[PDB]
């Protein structure tokens, strides 16, 4: 396991943070369908995680440049409806992602019909 680099303020795991884009409004927020269509209309996005029933949505991008370009262009958004765009960074970005990863583990429970027997599962074993 070759040493990445000596002591020079480094990081930890290189988990593609899909660039987290924090979007906050004051009401105009039409919804995930509209918010997704919006941001996606300015620049193709990967996935948009909008807090269903909330005014705070966080869209994930596949590239960092895409997020910067969208946030810069979002200034125009106000032309129709006041909207806020902020790119998560540092512990803030990692923190939000931490929540995502945890959600992925919990997702273990998938709908549909699977297995046979009583309602009991243990990591499949």
Curated annotation (Swiss-Prot):
Compartments where located: Nucleus, Nucleoplasm
Effect of residue 15 to A: Does not affect binding to the 7SK RNA
Effect recorded for residue 47 to F: Does not affect binding to the 7SK RNA
Result for mutant: residue 60 to A: Strongly reduced binding to the stem loop 4 of 7SK RNA
Span of domain xRRM: 14-125
Domain of life of the native organism: Eukaryota
Function in brief: RNA-binding protein that specifically binds distinct small nuclear RNA (snRNAs) and regulates their processing and function. Specifically binds the 7SK snRNA (7SK RNA) and acts as a core component of the 7SK ribonucleoprotein (RNP) complex, thereby acting as a negative regulator of transcription elongation by RNA polymerase II. The 7SK RNP complex sequesters the positive transcription elongation factor b (P-TEFb) in a large inactive 7SK RNP complex preventing RNA polymerase II phosphorylation and subsequent transcriptional elongation.
Family per similarity comment: Belongs to the LARP7 family.
Disease as annotated in the protein's UniProt record: Alazami syndrome: A syndromic form of primordial dwarfism, a condition characterized by severe growth restriction that has its onset in utero, and results in short stature and undersize. ALAZS patients manifest severe intellectual disability and distinct facial features including malar hypoplasia, deep-set eyes, broad nose, short philtrum, and macrostomia. Some patients have non-specific and inconsistent skeletal findings, for example, scoliosis and mild epiphyseal changes in the proximal phalanges, but no frank dysplasia.
Free-text domain note: The xRRM domain binds the 3' end of 7SK snRNA (7SK RNA) at the top of stem-loop 4.
Record's subunit section: Core component of the 7SK RNP complex, at least composed of 7SK RNA, LARP7, MEPCE, HEXIM1 (or HEXIM2) and P-TEFb (composed of CDK9 and CCNT1/cyclin-T1). Interacts with METTL16. Interacts with RBM7; upon genotoxic stress this interaction is enhanced, triggering the release of inactive P-TEFb complex from the core, yielding to P-TEFb complex activation. Associates with box C/D small nucleolar ribonucleoprotein (snoRNP) complexes.
Protein's name in the database: La-related protein 7
Lineage start: Eukaryota, Metazoa, Chordata, Craniata, Vertebrata
